[PDB]
A paper describes a structure:
The gamma-tubulin ring complex (γ-[name]) is the principal microtubule nucleation template in vertebrates. Microtubules are formed de novo in a process termed nucleation, which is spatially and temporally highly controlled by γ-tubulin complexes, composed of γ-tubulin1 and associated γ-tubulin-complex proteins (GCP). In most eukaryotes, microtubules are templated from a preassembled γ-tubulin ring complex (γ-[name]) that determines the position and direction of microtubule growth. Here, we used cryo-EM to identify and characterize γ-[name] assembly intermediates after recombinant expression of the complex, which allowed us to delineate a comprehensive stepwise assembly pathway from a stable 6-spoked core to the mature 14-spoked γ-[name], identifying successive stabilization and conformational locking of γ-TuSC units as central principles in the assembly process.
For this set of particles, we obtained a cryo-EM reconstruction at 7.5 Å global resolution. Structural features of the cryo-EM density indicated that all GCP variants have been incorporated into the complex in the correct order and that the lumenal bridge was formed correctly, including stable integration of [name] and two copies of [name]. Unexpectedly, we identified three previously unresolved [name]-[name] modules and one [name]-[name] module (see below) on the outer surface of the γ-[name], associated with the GRIP2 domains of [name] subunits (right).
Author numbering:
A (entry chain P): 3 to 41, 45 to 93, 101 to 177, 180 to 279, 287 to 306, 313 to 447
B (entry chain f): 7 to 113
C (entry chain B): 485 to 504, 524 to 815, 823 to 893
């Protein structure tokens, strides 16, 4: 129905501003919020409807120590948005404590959009794990979110902070954030900073202005993930019906994303399907087996051959698969978006559940362990000491991620009738 | 025989009580059938068959909706019943929809 | 054939505008030229008065549910009256809902003509009828463009509508199941006694959301879109009116042949009804297990308040008995859930190998789409 997005932290506000600029480029609209005279699509998914039909984006402008927000302020896209969502440390505990003391006014802004909106479907978070500004604040707000509304949805977009390795408490901060992320979020879009770094170096010669370029990649990802909702199709025109298929159990809600374009500066489905199924076309990094795989294709394609395509990949047996109850490769087709320059129309997308991400979690689990065992990487912070005198939150997050990795490995087994 | 005793055979068939075990139920049957015994209304047998077919489409018993069409041909064909409208009106009024079950009954 | 054009043109299409062998064959020179003029004009003027093409485009989206947006909002308003009996409802109730959905969605940017023609009806009621048993929209056909919309063709489109309505409904009913499962596994997160039966109910639900969700895409790419392409190809070509209705005879026959209305495979729809009923059984069971869980939570809360009501003990002995009851109620919940699980498995096995016996290549395509893993269909135990 009506979906409100949320953005917090400087990096989260950056990717949100890039996303709304990217949809201003995508749709036939002006940077005033005014529709053009040659413009179709649905604008009730993320556009709060003003009374000039200023399609104001449903995102709440959350920050701490605003620096890039001043750059957001002086922009010709600051007249595209601003429903008055703007707001006045680099650690988890300080952001947590400062978040709890100002929680009432941000919840007032939340209630302002939410009662201001027609209906409600879900809250989609733009987040960076261990971002300093994002961490602590976002975890507290996620606790507030599900406690306030158990009838609503909460999806998160979260990056995995690994820039080839300085903040040395970043394992602990990430543990607290993913602990809240597993038990207090309904669907997780996990992004790998290293894999996107490798592709960004691959397509270009860049290593230093990396944020701007991966912002392009990720905004293509978020636009693609909601394109079937924004555009008149037939399935997954709602968030929840889109989310419900991939998740077999409410701790496995972690989403690997795939995308056939890498250097983006006739065609048919059977090519790009087997192209996409190879994991170097996947921009996220014993035996691992996919739990469920879903594909959506947008471009210049004949839809009548796709069953023969599907027939081939059934004869491929190209992914080994999970030995319990039935999953398939899950195909959808969407319209290519008008009102924008459309070169190389054909682009595919893979939303899939894979077990290999647990190994990435194990990397943080290893790192946290050695730093915890050195007695040398908390550095005696007053917020951390005053909020928690016994330091048991690390223990709670550790047993949670241990139970989760055990759930991963037991789902890998042919028996998941046993406990995880 | 006569319609008064013939209403009493009906009360012996439906009920598990006889004619002197109960005559008060038989007294309700004479309350309704009396002052309605004789035809005074328009009757057409074409429409009531066309409402059993429209009910069997809604039952998704679509093989029997076309099997009634060959059995309704036999109802006109033998023609020992004076009003062929009445018995079809009775079974149509006593209907229900125990939903979809397809599959011809082979007459 | 030309005298079936001009005479039709002058009376029912209402154009009084002008249209003007050893016998040396005078005929052939003039006849073809007259044809090349007249039939093209009969197929130009009639489209720009009451459009034949626009209303058949709207027929795919609004009646055969191709629109997506509008049907979602129309089903977010009309939900209670269809979970209710349709023996106690009538037409004007259903009509009142429609205006709100046409203003709220992007049907407000569409022309007034397609909304004016769009209306609801309720047909003759079954003596045990419910809102999901029969319901249809109408979008009535009128004018001289009902020479392409045959009376039988419209009488079959609502027969299509009911099956499509059922499947589209069950995709929101399963999603309420997933939503309740979520909502009450973030209310129950600290109790150990319910964790097993919870996880088994969720593992039971997720095979179903799957099975039905991938069946829905076969409907997208074969039953609606590939049958709309053949209509567009045979309306683009057409040189006379008789071809435009021949395409209309294909735009139904493809749909009804693949939505199980055909005679050879009615037995398959009779099995497809039971999985929807099993989804209903799953709703019952999940709401009951989370009701027992809400009752334990409220018991814990009244336990929490009795302590401060006593101190400022004598309430532990009452608590151990409630704990004992909740702990002994677990294996019966396990037994009911495992019966439902095996039941669903034993019918999915029969369904998937019945597509590899039935008539026509088309329905065999579905059996590949449902299971790529070979989880079923090769190994009948759940691998």
């Amino acid at each position: 129905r009506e979906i409100i997005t949320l953005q917090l932290g400087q990096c989260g506000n950056q990717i949100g501003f890039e996303f709304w600029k990217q949809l201003c480029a995508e749709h036939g609209i002006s940077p005033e919020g005014i529709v053009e005279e040659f413009a179709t699509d649905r604008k009730d998914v993320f556009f709060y409807q003003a009374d000039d039909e200023h399609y104001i984006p449903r995102a709440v402008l959350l920050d701490l120590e605003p620096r890039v927000i001043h750059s957001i302020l002086n922009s010709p896209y600051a007249k595209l948005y601003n429903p008055e969502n703007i707001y006045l440390g680099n650690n988890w505990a300080s952001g947590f404590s400062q978040g709890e003391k100002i929680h009432e006014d941000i919840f007032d802004i939340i209630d302002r959009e939410a009662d201001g909106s027609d209906s409600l479907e879900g809250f989609v978070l733009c987040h960076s794990i261990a971002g300093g500004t994002g961490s602590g604040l976002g975890s507290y707000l996620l606790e507030r979110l599900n406690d306030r509304y158990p009838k609503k949805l909460v999806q998160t977009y979260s990056v995995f902070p690994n820039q080839d390795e300085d903040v040395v408490v970043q394992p602990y901060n990430s543990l607290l954030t993913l602990k809240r992320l597993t038990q207090n979020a309904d669907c997780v879009v996990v992004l790998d900073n290293t894999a996107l770094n490798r592709i960004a170096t691959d397509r270009l010669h860049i290593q230093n202005p990396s944020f701007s370029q991966i912002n392009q990649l990720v905004s293509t990802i978020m636009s693609a993930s909601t394109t079937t909702l924004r555009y008149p199709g037939y399935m997954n025109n709602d968030l929840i019906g889109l989310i419900a298929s991939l998740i077999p159990t409410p701790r496995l809600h972690f989403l690997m994303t795939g995308y056939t374009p890498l250097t983006t500066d006739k065609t048919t489905v059977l090519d790009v399907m087997r192209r996409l199924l190879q994991p170097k076309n996947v921009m996220v990094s014993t035996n691992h087996c996919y739990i469920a795989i879903l594909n959506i294709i947008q471009g210049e394609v004949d839809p009548t051959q796709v069953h023969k395509s599907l027939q081939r990949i059934r004869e491929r047996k190209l992914a080994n698969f999970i030995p319990w109850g039935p999953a398939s490769i899950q195909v959808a087709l969407s319209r290519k978006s008008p009102y924008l320059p459309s070169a190389h129309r054909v682009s595919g997308l893979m939303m899939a559940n894979h077990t290999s991400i647990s190994s990435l979690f194990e990397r943080t689990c290893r790192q946290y362990d050695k730093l915890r065992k050195r007695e040398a990487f908390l550095e005696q912070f007053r917020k951390e000491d005053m909020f928690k005198d016994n330091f048991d939150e690390m223990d709670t997050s550790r047993e949670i991620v241990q139970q989760l990795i055990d759930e991963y490995h037991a789902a890998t087994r042919p028996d998941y009738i046993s406990w995880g | 025989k006569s319609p008064n005793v013939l209403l009493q055979n009906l009360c012996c068939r439906i009920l598990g009580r006889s004619e002197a075990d109960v005559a008060q139920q038989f007294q309700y049957a004479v309350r309704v059938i009396g002052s309605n015994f004789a035809p005074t209304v328009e009757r057409d047998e074409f429409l009531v068959a066309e409402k059993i077919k429209k009910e069997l489409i809604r039952q998704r018993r679509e093989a029997d909706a076309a099997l009634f069409s060959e059995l309704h041909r036999k109802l006109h064909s033998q023609g020992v019943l004076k009003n062929k409208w009445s018995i079809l009106y009775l079974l149509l009024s006593l209907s229900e929809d125990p939903r979809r079950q397809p599959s011809k009954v082979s007459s | 054939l030309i005298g079936k054009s001009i005479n039709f043109l002058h009376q029912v299409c209402h154009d009084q505008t002008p249209t003007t062998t050893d016998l040396e064959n005078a005929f052939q020179g003039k006849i073809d030229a007259a044809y090349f003029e007249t039939s093209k004009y009969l197929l130009d003027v009639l489209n720009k008065k009451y459009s034949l093409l626009d209303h058949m485009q709207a027929m795919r989206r609004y009646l055969l549910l191709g629109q997506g947006d509008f049907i979602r909002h129309l089903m977010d308003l009309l939900k209670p009256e269809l979970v209710r009996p349709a023996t106690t409802l009538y037409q004007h109730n259903l009509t009142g809902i429609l205006e709100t959905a046409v203003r709220a969605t992007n049907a407000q940017f569409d022309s007034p003509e397609i909304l004016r023609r769009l209306d609801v009806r309720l047909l003759e009621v079954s003596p045990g009828d419910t809102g999901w048993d029969v319901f249809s929209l109408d979008y009535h056909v009128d004018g001289p463009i009902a020479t392409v919309f045959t009376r039988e063709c419209m009488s079959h489109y609502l027969r299509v509508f009911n099956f499509l309505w059922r499947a589209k409904r069950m995709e929101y009913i399963l999603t309420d199941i997933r939503k309740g499962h979520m909502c009450n596994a973030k209310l129950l997160r600290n109790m150990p006694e319910f964790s097993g039966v919870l996880h088994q109910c969720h593992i039971l639900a997720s095979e179903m959301v799957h099975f039905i969700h991938q069946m829905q895409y076969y409907i997208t790419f074969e039953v609606l879109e590939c049958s709309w392409d053949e209509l567009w190809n045979k309306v683009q070509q057409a040189q006379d009116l008789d071809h435009i209705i021949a395409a209309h005879e294909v735009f139904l026959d493809t749909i009804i042949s693949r939505c199980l209305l055909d005679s050879d495979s009615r037995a398959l729809l009779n099995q497809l009804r039971a999985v929807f009923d099993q989804i209903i059984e799953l709703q019952n069971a999940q709401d009951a297990i989370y009701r027992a869980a809400l009752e334990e939570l409220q018991r814990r809360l009244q336990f929490e308040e009795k302590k401060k009501q006593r101190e400022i003990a004598a309430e532990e002995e009452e608590e151990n008995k409630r704990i004992g009851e909740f702990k002994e109620s677990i294996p019966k919940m396990c037994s009911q859930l495992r019966i439902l699980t095996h039941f669903y498995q034993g019918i999915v096995q029969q369904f998937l190998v019945l597509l590899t016996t039935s008539s026509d290549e088309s329905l065999r395509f579905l059996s590949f789409r449902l299971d790529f893993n070979e989880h079923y269909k090769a190994r009948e135990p759940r691998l």
